[PDB]
């Protein structure tokens, strides 16, 4: 079949109350012929549409949970869809998918992950020496190293029964 | 008032080859003024993006196998799997597009009730699907520790003595 593709980008960390712009590059089909939508999947695995736009860009919709905070737009000459998020809250931490349900060929992107940080108070860090701050900063490396090692051990365990069954 | 999509069952454990049936009931008629009923069925295989299986209640997506049949009308809609295979396991969602907001069903997890009965190809596909799952968990950890570093990094930079 024909190759249609959507690729999300711009996801990452962002502070509560901060702003973030997501982009979705489209290829393989005439982008300007179709409406587009941003669908997000929360940690509880629920799917929710956060923004949708018609093919020419004049008509947009947002649900109440999000209305007023996100703005969807598109540049048809650039084959790109945009989602500008502002005043972000912890409820927005999710995977953000780009999709065009009007296409007869199934068109979803792999998604881009957005992580809203804690927003907790860190004013006590200003009286610390740089050496003490760097010691605190460096202590996060063994913690992340253990978490990544946990991931690889988790999937080494999952792979073993399937590998033995193939033999 | 937003249309609520009540999808059942929440979990369905099946043996391979057995039939399956998923229901989605709308709090409001999904018939549009143009005569069409915009109701889609999606399947999210583990570590994958959602994938459309049915649109317009009954039309089978050209990228979906001939083992899915969509039916229903008005407020009651149904997805039936003639025989559940390894490819079909995952979370299914119904999606209405007739009213805004275009809301989703709550999802239906189709899982297995054992690898000795699986073909080599199905075992390989199950092995291949683990790779995207692993890298996504790694990316979420990297973003998590990006958050934890930020206040410390900003406190260090604020102690600099250069103008730039």
């Amino acid at each position: 079949g024909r190759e249609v593709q959507l690729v999300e980008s711009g996801g990452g960390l962002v502070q509560p109350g901060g702003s973030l712009k997501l982009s979705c590059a489209a290829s393989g089909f005439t982008f300007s012929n179709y409406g587009m939508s941003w669908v997000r999947q929360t940690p509880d695995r629920r799917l929710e549409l956060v923004a949708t736009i018609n093919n020419n860009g004049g008509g947009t919709y947002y649900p109440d949970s999000v209305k007023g905070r996100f703005t969807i737009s598109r540049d048809n000459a650039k084959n790109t869809l945009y989602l500008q998020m502002s005043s972000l809250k912890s409820e927005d931490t999710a995977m953000y998918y780009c999709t065009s349900p009007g296409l007869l060929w199934d068109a979803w992107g792999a998604g881009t992950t957005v992580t809203v940080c804690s927003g907790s108070d860190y004013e006590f860090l200003k009286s610390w020496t740089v050496e003490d701050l760097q010691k605190r900063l460096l202590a996060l490396d063994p913690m992340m190293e253990q978490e990544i090692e946990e991931i690889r051990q988790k999937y080494q365990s999952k792979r073993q029964p399937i590998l033995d069954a193939i033999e | 008032r937003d249309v609520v999509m009540t999808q059942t069952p929440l979990t369905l454990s099946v043996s391979i080859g057995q039939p399956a049936s998923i229901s989605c009931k709308s709090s409001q008629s999904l018939l549009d003024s143009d005569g069409r009923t915009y109701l889609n069925w999606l399947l999210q295989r583990p570590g994958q993006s959602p994938k459309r299986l049915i649109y317009l209640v009954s039309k089978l997506d050209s990228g979906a196998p001939d083992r899915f049949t969509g039916s229903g009308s008005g407020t009651d809609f149904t997805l039936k799997i003639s025989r559940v295979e390894a490819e079909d396991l995952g979370v299914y969602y119904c999606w209405q597009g007739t009213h805004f907001p275009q809301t989703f069903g709550g999802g239906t997890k189709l899982e297995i009730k054992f690898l000795k009965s699986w073909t080599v190809e199905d075992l390989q596909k199950r092995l291949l699907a683990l790779d995207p799952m692993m890298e996504q968990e790694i990316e979420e950890i990297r973003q998590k520790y990006q958050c934890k570093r930020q206040p410390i990094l900003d406190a260090i930079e604020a102690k600099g003595t250069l103008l730039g």
């Binding site: 409406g35 949708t52 736009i53 018609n54 093919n55 008509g59 947009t60 919709y61 349900p101 009007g102 007869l104 | 549009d32 143009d34 069409r36 915009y38 889609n40 649109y55 317009l56 039309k59 597009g97 007739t98 805004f100 275009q102």
Partner: peptide
């Protein structure tokens, strides 16, 4: 023949 719906 439309298979989905987008804002007017």
């Amino acid at each position: 023949m439309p298979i989905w719906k987008f804002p007017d």
